[PDB]
Design a protein around this ligand. Structure first.
Ligand SMILES: [Mg+2]
Length: 164
RNA sequence: ACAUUUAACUAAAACCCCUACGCAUUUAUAUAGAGGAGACAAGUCGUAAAGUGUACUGGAAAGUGCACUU
């Protein structure tokens, strides 16, 4: 797959219409080797439904796409990155579903098909979650998803979904 | 534990005890499994008020609390 080039920091600064490098208020992992490492540690994703959060520039997104994922659902809150994610989607037809929304409220139990929903006592249900979010958002999210596991609802309606 | 016999008109003969050491003790090797250090990985890799210590941290790219230094 011929994916478009990864944005540089100058291109990111222009994209946020910020015109400077000091007021980013955000840190980007623009090194594809570390993102490749992270996706490797996420497990074998060949033909796996991956729900990715906090894409931003899209290093994790490109790394996941390079793995033979079946469908990749992406949720982005900043609309300014949606153009880049859209070009990335055009590069990979039918393997990227972008959604503009907030991960603390987005409802994943309806995103993927119902044929995926495996029992709790069987193996994890081929659905993986990967995320590099702001640290101010990852802890409410993990608390919320722990509550979901305790209730066996939300992303864990499919079974014992693994998170990275 | 165990015990002085014969013999002695030259002088000699005889002698023979019974008790472990083991699921004890020392060190070493082999084996399941787990954990460390080394090579700043080399590129046909990518690019352009502050500080120190300590305590909590569940909206932690660091914050707040206390004490310090310039
Ligand atoms: Mg706090």
């Amino acid at each position: 797959c011929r994916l478009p080039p990864l944005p540089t920091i100058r291109e990111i600064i222009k994209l946020l219409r910020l015109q400077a490098a000091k007021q980013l208020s955000q840190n980007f992992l623009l090194d594809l080797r570390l993102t490749d490492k992270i996706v490797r540690k996420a497990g074998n994703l060949t033909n796996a439904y991956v729900y990715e959060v906090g894409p931003g520039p899209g290093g994790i997104t490109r790394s996941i796409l390079n793995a033979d994922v079946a469908e990749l659902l992406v949720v982005e809150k900043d609309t300014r990155f949606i153009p880049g994610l859209q070009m990335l989607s055009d590069a990979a037809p039918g393997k990227l579903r972008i959604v503009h929304g907030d991960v603390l409220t987005f409802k994943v139990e309806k995103a993927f098909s119902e044929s995926l929903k495996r029992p709790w006592e069987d193996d994890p249900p081929n659905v993986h979650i990967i995320g590099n979010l702001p640290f101010s958002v990852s802890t409410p999210l993990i608390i919320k998803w722990l509550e979901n596991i305790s209730c066996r609802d939300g992303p864990f309606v499919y079974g014992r979904t693994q998170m990275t």
